[model samples]
Target: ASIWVGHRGTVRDYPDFSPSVDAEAIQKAIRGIGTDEKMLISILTERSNAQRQLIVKEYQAAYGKELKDDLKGDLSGHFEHLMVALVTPPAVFDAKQLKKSMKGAGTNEDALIEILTTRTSRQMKDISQAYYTVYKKSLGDDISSETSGDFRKALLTLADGRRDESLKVDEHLAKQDAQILYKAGENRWGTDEDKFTEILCLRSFPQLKLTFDEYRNISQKDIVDSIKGELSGHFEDLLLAIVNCVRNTPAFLAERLHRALKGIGTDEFTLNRIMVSRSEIDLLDIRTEFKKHYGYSLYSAIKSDTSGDYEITLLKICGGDD
Candidate 1:
């Protein structure tokens, strides 16, 4: 069985980080006649999330102003968004993203799927707590109201943050699950989405991988292919996301990055979210996977699509070429 320790991230703890010094520099950068975009990017991107949090606190104490608010005032567009994302706590950042995805007009279903499908149970728990504390409503409740039917059911299950996080895998149970999933979707005239949801959403990743293998043996089709044939719309997308994450999380994220960076115009929001959120997680792996799948470095991709402060800031977070 394979163990799933995350890949080494590009962003790590900076040596000799001083919150006061950073706070002061940030204050100066913002206070000056022209905002130092370079200075803001250099200082914010160089530090880990923990260090950035400290700077936020120190900035408030030293300058008597919120660091995020200061950045908001000084910077504009994608640059400002990246700067604010850097300073916020990871859970709070994710919570805010979740809220934004579900807020007003038409819901950003892709964002909803990306975040909820990819996050760990612990991360989901923190995000749910933060959502309630920040927005005064349960994440599950919001998801339920915004989405409906099988898709909503799956999202709510994931949002509950109760997925099994165990490393142990049971082959017998895996086979049983494989058979059950097959029966639920392929064999029956009507799909039993709840069975699919419960198994996919609740099982540990290791267990799910084994189930996928057993499923292939019995059904003679990859689980993802089975899902595509049987389900449609957001439900299929969410299940496929889970399967992709189970098989290779970094690769899944790499595909997402590719989608964001490719085409005529850029999806700056998705690009920004993935780069910042995964910087301290499996970004290195995402970089490698991006190169393998896309035939070019993520560095070059970002360089080609973006320019100026926003481009430079993204490049810094990217660390280096593959």
Candidate 2:
């Protein structure tokens, strides 16, 4: 139930990025005809957006290559595409990815979470800035005009970033929390899925784990099974995972990926969410855990199963490039 979004300034919202950087290394990159692609990508990918913008600004001043134009001409496919895309900051990137997914055909739920849940206030402001830059409109205006249902409202609420009650858990609060979960899952006449609203979105990872351990001791059943016996449908699955994540995040995520890839092509939403959300905190562990459990590298599994420009970006993110 931790916020699934990771980091603030790792990438741009969409097209356009920092240029003309001031660093000696960036200078070296500029001077060399053939640059170290890995290093170049890593340097650009890891910097905060503001830092990237400065990088671009100085790269141009020093190298005489308009950072944006040169990067556009230099890199190819998703590699180039994401680097360029990162130039746009958070809001514009969010808007563009959402528009891209929802506009032509399919719903990019991955894009939805990337925008709605992960961003900070400052990033959202940048996103809003991008909206005006690209569309001559407000980010909220774009969201209202483009998205609908409880999804839009929930997403917009999350975009505010105050919704993450990560610190709200208490180890001693187990009885209180278990009562809430039990009522939501088993005790209630009608399942009020709102418990999921908190468990899946609000609680900190460590707190959730402690709380779940307490819940199992009290309830005499694992949270996953408790939800399985009580709820049905997509909500059941989500709630089950929330319970599991609370109990053990790396184990929970590893199981999700294993299920996703065992069949053929992975579920793209599950794949992306695991990568984007877990990359920072438990990702290193998730990778190690994945190998111990599945005897495979998550990176190898993903690269073998997926294809295309966006897939490449996903790989880079999953590879710990940032």
TM-score of 2: 0.60
Per-candidate total of colliding backbone pairs: 0, 23
Instruction: For residues 1-322, write the lDDT of model 2, one tens digit per residue.
Output: 2222344212323244345333447556545477545666556556544566677667666767766676677667545656666454345555565556555554555455444444444555556566667878665665655566534554555445444444565667666776688778666677665665565455555666766776787778877777678766534544555455555567766777777776855565556544544444456667777788877787787777777655666666665421
Q: For each candidate, what TM-score against the reference? A: 0.97, 0.60
lDDT (Cα, tens digit) per residue for candidate 1, span 79-151:
8898899888989999999998988888998999999888888888888989999999899899989999999
Distance from true position, residue 37, model 1, in Å? Answer: 1.0
Clashing pairs in 1: none
Off by over 4 Å in 2: 1-51, 59-76, 85-101, 110-157, 164-172, 198-200, 229-241, 244-283, 302-322
Q: After best superposition, candidate 2 residue 180: deviation in angstroms?
A: 2.5
Candidate models: Cα lDDT each: 0.91, 0.58
